[model samples]
Target chain A: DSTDETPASYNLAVRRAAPAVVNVYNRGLNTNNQLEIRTLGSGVIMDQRGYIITNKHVINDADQIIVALQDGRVFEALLVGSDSLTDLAVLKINATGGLPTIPINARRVPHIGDVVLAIGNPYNLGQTITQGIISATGRIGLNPTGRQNFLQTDASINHGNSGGALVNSLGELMGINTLSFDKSGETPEGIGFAIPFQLATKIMDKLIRDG
Target chain B: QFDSTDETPASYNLAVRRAAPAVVNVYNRGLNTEIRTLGSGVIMDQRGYIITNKHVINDADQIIVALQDGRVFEALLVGSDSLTDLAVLKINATGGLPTIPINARRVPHIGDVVLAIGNPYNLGQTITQGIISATGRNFLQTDASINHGNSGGALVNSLGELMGINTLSFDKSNDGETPEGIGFAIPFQLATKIMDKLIRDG
Candidate 1:
């Protein structure tokens, strides 16, 4: 009887949204002159036109940006714009092949305690999925650049997990995985902050329009 | 829980309800008036045998446990194994006690959804979710956020069956860099083995 129960999973959400999450590489010339990845992070593909959203710090001072999809397709991306306040950046890639975009439901409001997953490239360990529930909802940011409200969760977000997708159980975009809270000697656990889905979309639209 | 545009929120509330009652707050007291250490423990059976981390109860003159409901008791140290970092406590079973759900036949697989229910940083009973990253490897690895006070808590699957006992959260390597979200737990099979031996020998 124990084995008869179906195991729990967020596979539905992962199947619907994981393909749209891509690896971002910030490449620049090293001391010897060879172009290598200086830093890396994750990004979410927003539409068919190949507009991607990542952290501004991820692509900062890079000679070139490379976007690699989960489907083995790679493309050089152009920097559309970067926002200092939210630490978000927009990139675009032109590809003839089909593209996958993250599932977005603008109407659904994210609530605290809603089970959420963080899909990203942690330590460049390839695409990884971490799950947790939203610890706090609508957390007001210390500053604003449309970064005023954030969704806080216990989901593990590491260095390379920045700018990745934070999706709910139904695979709807809840937020963009951002920074974690760690202080000296006080290694805080399970405290991570994210840019809410609505705010991320507003900034994405703004960046796309102005840039 | 129904609306036109909004789907029902996904939750592990079922698991929380089933296991939270069995996870108790463990406190180690240095003096009669002072509480020195704080951690968590899981009640394993109706006989009032509780399992927690050995490190949590080390060097304590007295150990006090508080259940989620209003029960409090002075627990006796049953036994401990330093290698596995596990310790057992026995409370007087004058009344009924909630025990963790266990399915000994269930084999945990990688990517199986699990919830870690514990008292992290002395925070009241909290539940954090993650999938089983690996199994049978020294310690069961999970991405669930395990903290200082979380040691000895129950790591249960989505079905609310015991999977492991939260042991350690790896932080601050010798290389001066810290790993994030990497925590280890003692598999329930091994924990049960230790508990049985401790009770029999003690």
Candidate 2:
């Protein structure tokens, strides 16, 4: 017996996953020894040990990292490790008390046209939540490095939205917002893509072991 | 005598003082293209000559100027400086026209109040107030709210003096999801220098 209601899917996902999404801020020293602070992207608290997952580009070459939760609690995080190839990074926060984590359901793979929620800090304009449908799947494209398989959506993603989470209707992490195609005379009107979580989970596992 | 407690009169005075008559709505008809581009320009001289950005009049086959008092006239493109993004135009139909304030004031500093007077996004003659988020830097980094239709509009200071001519914004970094605050404007100093050179060279 399948008790599935289409309209309630997005509401259920937002209710479950909104709490796990966080705003990430980083400060670091460049090669010139200049103190540079940048507020970029968002992350998801994946584990109770305060292990957070975000895109590698968000904390690339950073010295200090901070994460702000929805409850207004901020934590100083240490970068574990990152995979530039996959564009995934993990950060751990030392917690004296309990920490909330979003449950990762493995069986749920989003179908095409499935309602998805993209949560991130777009344009460094604070926490933003956007909704769109999964436009396509198994889309392979070439980047500066090489070819990559990405899940395409129509959700609005901007410059600072590099490391946000794309969740399915079941509130399960489906992918990570990585890149979008933008060309001259062509606007990124309603097309966005994300890195599948199936690939992200493997990167996360490697980061946990290596760190 | 101006009284401090008289709020209505003071508000009226402020409105009138900020009101710009030299700023006019510009409509152009392209040669081959059926699309009409609408923008804004400011009259620089009392002889019915206006100063605007070159991109505004680019590809324009027929140019029309509409005054604030609802009078309309056909205008001729005099000369344009593409490097400095300044264009001088002349309208033959003239009598008691409002002229721009070009007494060579000091360049506006960062955080100084500025008014972006133009037809933004093809929406008639509109005024947006913002501070000079940056100055004397790369023309692309300035944070002013102007769009494609506002390419030739005037960036005016608090005293209603022209500071810069609005130009294009940063496009490479922008995703086109929202209008980014990154806008470009040609400095008045550069415009004046270009005008002097045009007179000497042309």
Candidate 3:
């Protein structure tokens, strides 16, 4: 039964989209020590059957990759394929229980001042959401591809935020949080850029289908 | 477990366009490497006095303001305060410039939606959205992302009023707490005081 009180609400997009965002960890051995070294990033569950997508740099030469779900389940991710140019990667896990998934809307071209949410895991912390407005569309020059047209947002992003989901106001996946602007010796703030959903939706198809 | 009391816009086009022209992209030059650092500033008056983070113009020999309409102007640093990380600069635009009004009446309360306007990553003018996570807690906190090139950028509320300056997202863990998701910005009241002081003295 609904009460008379109006529901004091907050970020509905985050509530609708958070479950599909997973924490990714890359474990490998360094030359100096035979022990396992751990690196972290974020990913979005693209399929209920265990397919996930992330940044290619997140799992480069990783000996073992791990995926931790919002429900406390962790699985070893199988590398399917990765594209360095687009920085998209595909992984799979043996899933008996269907994984939670967020709807993908690659055509959701974000407009400046449009509300957006960036969901990711950084510093091994669990999934977190940062909100901002669409700052620009088709932002380029960071990647060598020369074809890179990023959707820029002021949504707080940091190390390990790569491959996370950048969603529009409707909680529709619009881009992948890929990289932020970094210069030597200075810790800048407020700049987070993402790979457009149109690009990601296209890149993921090849990584999952062709692999 | 879902009902109604939802549904919103797909974009903030009108609000952003109004504020965009008033937001200026700052280039800080004079360092030895021939590379100019990028920062953001908000035009506060018809004559072009801008408010930005002090760190953006700190140690700079020459400053340039790139308006939203693609016009660039040489700017003079009015004053700066390292303690609060706020700075003011004056550009020679006499023919009336678009101004973004600062909200000094009251600071944004928790849950009020806000937008960040600036040049983050130096990729040009950008905006990020988030709700005011906290207020009057010594600093403003929002989930909205701000970064290196965003210094001096405008963090305004849904109504397009300047709320604060997009400052930093603390990375290092604090002594007793985790600084993972918390973002901090200086309120306009404090920033305005500094701006007025700089206009008078420095």
Which candidate comes out best when scored by lDDT?
1
CAPRI band for model 1: incorrect
Ranking by TM-score: 3, 1, 2
lDDT of 2 by residue, A1-211 (tens): 4567554336666667777888888887767857667647788888888888888878876778888887788898888898887778998998876776664666556554455778888777877777665544662333332444677665667766667778765566778887444532424234567888778778888889975
- Point out the worst 10-residue segment of candidate 2 chain B by lDDT: B4-13
Candidate 2 vs. true structure, TM-score: 0.47
Q: Who is ahead in DockQ, 2 or 3?
A: 3
* lDDT, residue B88, candidate 2: 76
lDDT per residue, candidate 1, B100-152, as tens digits? Answer: 99999998999998888887666466678788998767689998888788899
Number of the top DockQ candidate: 3
Worst lDDT run of 10 residues, candidate 1 chain A, spans A139-148
Which of candidates 1 and 2 reaches a greater DockQ? 1
- The sequence of per-residue lDDT tens digits that candidate 3 reaches over residues B1-202 is 2322254546667767667779898988886644367789989887678998887777788898988776789999888877888889998877778898655676578887777777765666777667788877657988766656777888787678888877777777567654544677888777777888989996
DockQ score of each predicted structure, in the order shown: 0.20, 0.01, 0.39
Give one digit per residue, the lDDT tens place, for model 3 in A1-211.
6777777333677777788999999989877756474678999998777888898888997989989988999999999998888788988989887788876653344677776788998776778887666677874445322555877676778787899998866677778888655553555455667888777777878878785
lDDT of 1 by residue, A1-211 (tens): 7788888688988998899999999999978869998999999999888899999999999999999999999999999998888889999999998799898888888764579999999899999998789755652323222444667678877888998999999888898888555552457778677888888888999999996
Q: How many residue pairs clash in each candidate?
A: 0, 0, 19
Fnat of model 3, as a fraction: 0.76
- Residue B32 error, candidate 3, Å: 5.8
RMSD, one per candidate, in order: 8.0, 18.4, 5.7
Candidate 1 wrong stretches, greater than 4 Å: A1-113, A117-131, A135-152, A156-167, A170-180, A192-211, B1-6, B172-174
